[PDB]
Design a binder for this molecule. Structure first.
Ligand code: NAG
Ligand code: NAG
Ligand code: GLU
Ligand code: GLU
Lengths: 433, 445
């Protein structure tokens, strides 16, 4: 029920391999992009570190990767395997509410944590989450970027849509706070999507948004699956062209919310932290087969869901050839989160074991508080050549790329229309409606 | 010693806010005389009365492991680890909702039933997130509805909301906001939040933010003891007596802590509290407590110094209610009834598992958490005040409240019972008194 890899130093991992189940079910449908891609990015990163002769010489990094199932309660059970009083550090989680609950226990046993996706402003508080760090910026900057985008387009009358939980509510709250302080932004209504929605709830939300027909723009902090079902309801009610979607990093440039629903999502403006597609991971992931990828205990489930068969399956399918494949947006952030942990251990080794290849007797047990100090201090170029750094709160700088979902003929893409680095740089020329 | 250990056949865990949260990061601060000591000592009292009894849990002694939460959920999580390893069969507490929630997260994994005496957050009713949680106090769903009715009855259709950072404050105000949005003509001017770790001058800044809507004089308040005190302190400092019309939740209740030495600024404040009565039995027990006989309570020496204003200066011959002012804390009844609920459930479980034996039989050697929870939800007994104690499917008490108003006659201050809320409002407007306005705020909106 987990991925175990032996090594000198063991790194913990938390990934949403499955979505949350319906009503009273813990785990649901497997996430191909948000789950497998990101999980496999950690294993790839560790493979690359272990291969290297310069970084952590004569030292093998081990793995303990667990499934969160998108639930914070389920992830809490899993996180108990990291503690008993050996896990030196933990990578994850993805969802903020999941990362918050895990951070609560990890700080008691002094285990450093680096997230690749969690953006909730609460997590930057060192009094509550001292052992938490992240390679993504807090939602404070993303909310401000949204207010700037809304201002630039002249949409002074907007509506907010949020998933229940920390990420959704805190994202919208920050947007509401900043818009109240500035002039020309007014909110028509706030809609909240429940954790366990009753049948027909998403259709009611669209109907509620249609109570204010002049509020066409909808700023939304909703999770991957919630956006899809919102767009699904809007498609059924023929609301194509009416709404003007503003999506957060949970939307980003993902394929999951827009698959088979391209027309309804046309013109949607989305935000995602600065990232690039990693070529090395693409070469690795495309060459994965049922035979060579036995480490991944969830890879057989992925195979069935990815190629649309049952182990019907020939067994000799190819990931990029037999099915459409594009690297998940936050794959870079996963790899950089692993390298952040690795460089910190490397810098700790350089001080505890001077001129000693391998782990010296002094570095038999890695001190958590000391390791946290090294993580917050690292400064290196990541998997894309971009610098990776942490501030006093363990945050990355507020740097984003602004996309827009555009169709030319029958080809779909998230085209870069701007970037936000303290100030908005929106290219109005490149936008399409 | 950092905890209260009392040995027995069946050990019951306890979580109490003996100390308040320290300033800016500091885990523990000032000792709570009423919220901490009164309630903690109420559990020890209840257990003494159960152990003495020949009919309830015959030939069986209830043990104790009581811990301090320091009003912090992070601190309480560290303490709650002592309850688990791979024996504690029941937990009483906590007080704060956010504290109870964080403890309930770990307790359900090791299947330990939990009964709270104070925690009122609506989220705790969910048997998906917190199936092993129960409470002898009603959820804030009812209290917020009660507050709406009071506001409707008084004609205050333009209100502001004030909340402490955390589950109790935020979701208490949210419940009030959601009801106001769905039905009625009650409008909300602004929603303010009190920071968990406030900087110097924060409470004066909050009062000044509330003045940014001068028409909204009425303030719905879901804040803890310490926050209410400092809010009223800032209002006195900024000379705002008569202006604000406070609507306080059970965290305000009929408590002395926020109004002590600040009687004038709190005049006219309307407060809510679940139905309760003062128990004479506990008063007789708590008054006769000395430094010599109460060695069980490891925090009693600290309480002594704080209660009489001396240093262990102290004669040693001081007496509770005689040398210092004393009144039983409002939620003492709920602590005792929470302990008795755990006792009656174990009694009812004993009756099915050991139908003949008097005392722990071989089948009662290990207490199953899932089994005990079923008995806790099924108990039906009259409590320490004669009031019936029941639990619904979600493990909640019915929504039954009393409404108070803080009134000053001449040289006497009290919380006068001005009404009650039991599914519907019964408010006596004739018995209400108001403070004189010293400062007026003109509006231009
Ligand atoms: C790696 O470690 C092993 C065992 O400690 C040792 O025998 C070997 O010489 C080391 N390799 C290098 C290149 O130092
Ligand atoms: C109480 O328990 C003890 C020890 O098991 C036993 O000897 C005694 O008889 C019991 N008392 C009664 C009244 O049954
Ligand atoms: N930024 C989101 C995570 C969304 C994702 O996994 O892309 C959160 O903090 O919950
Ligand atoms: N009702 C408050 C507890 C206040 C008290 O202890 O009086 C809460 O749920 O946090």
């Amino acid at each position: 029920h987990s991925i175990r890899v032996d090594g000198d130093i063991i790194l913990g991992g938390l990934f949403p391999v499955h979505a949350k189940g319906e009503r009273g079910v813990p785990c649901g449908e497997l996430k191909k992009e948000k789950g497998i891609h990101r999980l496999e990015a950690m294993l790839y990163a560790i493979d690359q570190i272990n291969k290297d002769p310069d970084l952590l010489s004569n030292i093998t990094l081990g793995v303990r990767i667990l499934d969160t199932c998108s639930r914070d309660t389920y992830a809490l059970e899993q996180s108990l395997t990291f503690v008993q009083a050996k896990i030196s550090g933990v990578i994850g989680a993805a969802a903020s509410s999941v990362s918050i609950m895990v951070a609560n226990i990890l700080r008691l046993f002094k285990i450093p944590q680096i997230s690749y996706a969690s953006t909730a402003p609460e997590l930057s508080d060192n009094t509550r989450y001292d052992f938490f760090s992240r390679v993504v910026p807090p939602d404070s900057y993303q909310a401000q970027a949204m207010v700037d985008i809304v201002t630039a387009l002249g949409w002074n009358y907007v509506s907010t849509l949020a998933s229940e939980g920390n990420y959704g509510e805190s994202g919208v709250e920050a947007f509401t706070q900043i818009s109240r302080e500035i002039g020309g932004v007014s909110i028509a209504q706030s809609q909240k999507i429940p954790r366990e929605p009753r049948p027909g709830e998403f259709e009611k939300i669209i109907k509620r948004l249609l109570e204010t027909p002049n509020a066409r723009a909808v700023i939304m902090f909703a999770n991957e699956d919630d956006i899809r079902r919102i767009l699904e309801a809007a498609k059924k009610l023929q609301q194509s062209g009416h709404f003007l979607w503003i999506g957060s990093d949970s939307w980003g440039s993902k394929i999951a919310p827009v698959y088979q629903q391209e027309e309804i999502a046309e013109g949607a403006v989305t935000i995602l932290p600065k990232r690039a597609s990693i070529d090395g991971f693409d070469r690795y992931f495309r060459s994965r087969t049922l035979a060579n990828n036995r480490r991944n205990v969830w890879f057989a489930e992925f195979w069935e869901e990815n190629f649309g068969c049952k182990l019907k399956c020939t067994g000799l399918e190819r990931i990029a050839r037999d099915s459409s494949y594009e690297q998940e947006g936050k794959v870079q952030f996963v790899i950089d989160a692993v390298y952040s942990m690795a460089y910190a251990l490397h810098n700790m080794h350089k001080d505890l074991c001077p001129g000693y290849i391998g782990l010296c007797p002094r570095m038999s047990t890695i001190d958590g508080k000391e390791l946290l100090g090294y993580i917050r201090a690292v400064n290196f170029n990541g998997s894309a050549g971009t610098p990776v750094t942490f501030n006093e709160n363990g945050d990355a700088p507020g740097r984003y790329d602004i996309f827009q979902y555009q169709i030319t003929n029958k080809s779909t893409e998230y085209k870069v229309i701007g970037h936000w680095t303290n100030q908005l740089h929106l290219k109005v020329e490149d936008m399409q409606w």
